Symmetry: D2
Subunit: 417 residues, 4 copies
């Protein structure tokens, strides 16, 4: 993480001050659970009141112990009497407290992700309803295709992020677990009853089968979800970058307070942001390949990409929302492009004569191509030349919008559950 | 996909014939929906005589340069000008492809689910057979504390059952169909015609579609398959560890010649082969992610890649699940070699003795550590003697014999199994 | 590989017939070297003439033996006597023959790539010299920046693919090796002299340290070169896709047929495929001790397609470049319709010449047919500066921006 | 990047002050070249004397302008009079200074990586010297195969890192460029003469064809090699972790014994691999530029060199301090025997007219193996030949026969005679 995109509350969760404090919150959970066995009643509350998080001293102790778990508990043990810290960190293994506290840093980070994601979904839906009645020329392969609702470009990103919102909220109810199983998950000292009571205090369910560590596929699943959101971010930014260029010139980003040129510098940044979150996916997958009950190759990688994952995501979910809000939509440039193009009308009259006349395609194709009001005279040819009586619709600007946007109301409500 | 790893039922789903066979059903599903607006029985009449001719489509495509128009030309040339008049009417080409691709994916997901359920059955079988086998747990590859050998398979079991439910969650709704026109404006078609045509196929309507269905659904499935690649790789590495000559706890059951000069040398060729398969599956998740960023209402940039990895990814997914199941069943467990390693090591007893004294006595940590150091005699009764004689305290120390170790380190093996089995 | 994207010459190399063929060539290369000592002379040449290559026979034997190399050598042995096939596959390990023959498939495939790569470099420079004098609007962040030579675009990809071309030419000389090192590379029966003889027969250098296998980071480096080519292709295809769109409409893919950049969109997905294999080869680098067979199944998948997609993609991009239709007037009418970029040109003109500061020269330019005469009228009257401002009409715009286009082309092409 | 693995000299290369200092070095390179034109002579040396880099001042200006280079110019411009700073940042576009200074940072980051990688090959070679004499068991699929030299494990990793060192020094020669071509590379205000002159002041060659930015295939060419280097780092790490396990117990890292070093470096290799895809995607820039690479390059470029320098020196120390337990090595060779049956099989077929399947039943039937075998074939088979007796020293003389040749071909200078 660098200072330019840093969000202080996100990096605070992954700062060593919160890393050690979450470890301590897990230590007091298993200590309070063991109070029903060999630990005196009230010992956990005694430590919870006077415990001080001292990261510099831990690093000082870590130089001697060469292990962050031995320096942490020592920094807590030297603040109390030997009778007090007797059963502190008792029965659990090193990664029992590390990963259980690791899942705490992940739970609290998800709240910032889910909140700003839903705030982004609302900003997209808001921008869709403003531009729902603006008609634009859809582009297939970059070519003009048929007129559509310009709000559907925003409604398309809305329903995508909305599917991502269900992915995160499903994980929040399930994927997060903790472990108090002991050394290699064999419960040499503790019991599953102790793990149950301790996990009940923390508020996260119990790992069904846990080795020395927590199985890394659970974190991998969450990071793979952020990869899906990144492709949604990138697709939305590419949409904005396309309509921002001079050849299109239908949207541009706000210029804050203040040589004055319009440039899509915001959504280009959000493209690089998505490139970072996409790269974390394989990292999460490789961290799943551990030897027997554990190897610690996942730790250093998690120290890097886990703080950047939530940090980049929250900064991206917030920057994307504000960029949509400050986005300037130029309606006259959007709808004039629909007026100047008429090539899509060749297929409209084609499907109209095929549907309402008993003529084949080639017969219906030769009549339209052989053909002010393109509707007025083509209707006369059916009655005069073909002796067929029917009323075509007038394909002026009001007939175009009424034809192609006649279903946009149904698309919006089927999007909103 | 190559013939060496080709799976019959899966390769047929993605071949040219069944590709067009599903596109035909999509053409007739929307055609029957248009019969309310198209004469009655037109889709049923085309359904009864339709022929899928992949060689003919290839010849039409050499001129038209459009696979869908070539498929339409091959189908319309089988009927009258009037009978095939409303064929491919109102829909866009991608309305046919993506709606049919879902039926292909669904037919592939049905086999993967069944093959993934089968692997969970085998893992839970070996977990029960090797449940009461005591083995040395290893952290950083180092001897740690003894544990159950069946805990390894149960650990892999619940992992595949996590991905199994995710697949079933995707099976309930992860795929859609669409009939939205050129750029999703529903100019010629209607939502009523689109919705009703979907129930003929049996899939939900895409909520917001452009020319194509959003690619994040395919990417979501590939994501569930990306995680499975990790699950397959870990179980493969685990058995590769046990199979080595230095450990020699298990070996893959094999007329088969393992080596040239040593018939039959036992090598973990199955779990190693599956590791290469996992590397191929993982690499596809970067393609499916990049395919989501399509320009405006569509670009065809995802078609070339999807023609490559989608048939291979499903073909490998089915091949890998089946071979791992055959390996898990035929893997033979050397019971004595596993348990003879646990007796040869005494290091884990010192940890249990010191946490026994701290829990049962008022002594502190480093006071207990020096006691167990100075302590063939019974380690339990000799230290219980010094507790009574030298330190003057009475405590009942369970004796750490070979079966006393299994009573200590396999204590919660019942509850771990109970909460794991569904 | 699939039938739609199958290339004839490339798929021929990776077929089981040639796969078994190059195995035989490698086997006969070491056995010919073993004739100098313990093997009767002339045995390798006798097997070379009578040995059939029967994939249906190998698969018939492999169904039992579960060992591809045993089934291969057995199929070759049964076509000779016990006295002609005595020392066939003697002393070598199974991967001595596989990895040596695998490099042969890589060598011959690589020649087709370099051929079709430099051929794509020819199409790019041909289009570059054609459109050198054309002037177009440059775009930064998609927004109109300044006028530029349209030929600089194709030259930008020319030198990029030229960079990838030298990387393969460097690799083709120093990239591949063979081996005959025994079971785990300890040289029990085999000697370095016999191995060097067989290697000199095949024509490839010897691996420095050989385990049971050849270090797979050699393959991974080749793929890395091809991974960069995937981005060079995608960047070039993305450029054509942008110019093709209706809002730009500067070029279109040549063949009422409908105009879409369908070929460059095809190459975008191809490029993602070539880029997907780079991390595959990297994970194959991490073997266990002397070897683990994990890399074979993955290479049986991605290597035949990596070479296939590469040649297939380079050829289609070559055909698309030559047949691409450039619309010169629309390209140059867009420069006539843009105006605001001249503010930066007149600004630096008054700064570098008139002793006025940046804020002073800015004021007057936008306060101010042909702008050069108007600005020079202001400098001569109120400012009272006598200076000659060059005409900024269409022809004068080409002279200003394309003034150094000769130096760019000459420095980017060796003999030019 | 985090302080836990931070290399101060590397994180300072990519810190804010060195970033601007290299940009200011590039700004004065073009300004000095323009002294042969409209810019007054000696103006570059004028600004270079009293130039003060103020990161927090630049951040203050960018908080309003939302443009990093305008903020970087204002901080340098306002320190002098208008006439002196009149020609500062003149004719160049932003990315002329952004990317050309980025090449200066990368070059400085490359100077450290080359040294560490070179020193790792020396230590790996040194460790191969200490362990060359030790006979070990070669493992195929983790299974016992044939005996080999233990030092060949360090020699195999040595020649791989040396191939990566040859890749890095090749890129060191031609790989980094500077650009002064202007807005879209059109040389509107400047000339190729101005660009060529300022390039010698910076010591780097001129980019052949540059758009608004420098094409990202050069940086991608460097990050790709770092992924190749990381592949060597994980293969060597997994090797040590294999020989470290309790069942093998053939090595242990120097100072309860855990391979925490090579496991941590294995995690270092995973982060470096992910950088490749970002470097490959940073090349796909729209037209003459888009800035989407910038935010990514602000992250993985300092993280790549920081992790790489750390991993090359930690693996060197791990190799420096790795303890080799020779007693456990060679007695594992004495314990098991299987390759011997393959040896006598290849020996009988070589020197006797019998066939492979004939000699296999003879070797399997069988105290001294060589003596007993030499008597069976002269009794019932009537074969007179010299069968070498293969004991521990006899096995070493056979399976380590060509070990000196593998070493001489692996090291360029070894084997040459001097004086
Ligand atoms: O008719 C179609 O569905 C395809 C149109 C297109 O190729 O743009
Ligand atoms: O050549 C052998 O001994 C067999 C080798 C292998 O199975 O790789
Ligand atoms: O004047 C410059 O160098 C920068 C211009 C820009 O911000 O694009
Ligand atoms: K645990
Ligand atoms: K559609
Ligand atoms: K070998
Ligand atoms: K430039």
């Amino acid at each position: 993480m660098i200072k330019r995109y840093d969000v202080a509350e996100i990096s605070k969760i992954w700062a060593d001050e919160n890393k050690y404090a979450k470890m301590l919150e897990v230590e007091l959970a298993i200590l309070e659970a063991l109070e029903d066995r060999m630990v005196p009643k009230g010992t956990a509350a005694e430590i919870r009141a006077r415990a001080q998080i001292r990261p510099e001293r831990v690093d000082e102790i870590e130089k001697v112990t060469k292990h962050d778990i031995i320096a942490f508990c020592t920094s807590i043990a030297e603040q109390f009497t030997a009778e007090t810290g007797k059963f502190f960190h008792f029965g659990v293994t090193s990664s029992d407290i590390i990963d259980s506290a690791l899942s705490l840093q992940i739970r609290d980070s998800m709240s910032y992700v889910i909140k700003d994601l839903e705030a982004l979904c609302d900003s997209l839906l808001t921008k869709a309803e403003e531009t729902k009645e603006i008609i634009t020329m859809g582009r297939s392969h970059g070519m003009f295709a048929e007129p559509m609702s310009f709000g559907q470009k925003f409604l398309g990103a809305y329903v995508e992020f909305k599917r991502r919102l269900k992915d995160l909220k499903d994980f929040q109810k399930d994927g997060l677990t903790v472990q108090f199983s002991g050394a290699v998950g064999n419960y040499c000292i503790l019991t599953t009853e102790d793990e149950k009571k301790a996990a009940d205090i923390l508020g996260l369910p119990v790992e069904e089968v846990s080795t020395q560590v927590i199985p890394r596929d659970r974190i991998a699943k969450l990071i793979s979800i952020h990869g899906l959101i990144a492709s949604a971010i990138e697709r939305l930014a590419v949409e904005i970058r396309h309509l921002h260029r001079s050849d299109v010139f239908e949207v541009y980003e706000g210029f804050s307070k203040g040589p004055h040129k319009k440039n899509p510098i915001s959504t280009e940044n959000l493209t690089g942001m998505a490139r970072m979150l996409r790269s974390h996916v394989s990292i999460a997958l490789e961290n799943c390949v551990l030897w027997h009950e554990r190897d610690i190759s996942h730790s250093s990688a998690e120290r890097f990409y886990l703080p950047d994952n939530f940090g980049i995501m929250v900064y991206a979910l917030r920057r994307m929302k504000n960029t949509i809000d400050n986005l300037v939509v130029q309606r006259d440039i959007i709808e004039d492009r629909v007026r100047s193009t008429s090539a899509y009308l060749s297929s409209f009259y084609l499907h109209f004569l095929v549907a309402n006349t008993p003529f084949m395609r080639e017969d219906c194709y030769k009549i339209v191509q052989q053909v002010e009001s393109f509707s007025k005279k083509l209707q006369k040819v059916m009655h005069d030349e073909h002796n067929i009586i029917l009323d075509i619709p007038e394909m002026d600007f009001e007939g175009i919008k009424k034809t192609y946007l006649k279903e946009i109301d149904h698309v919006f409500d089927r999007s909103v559950k």
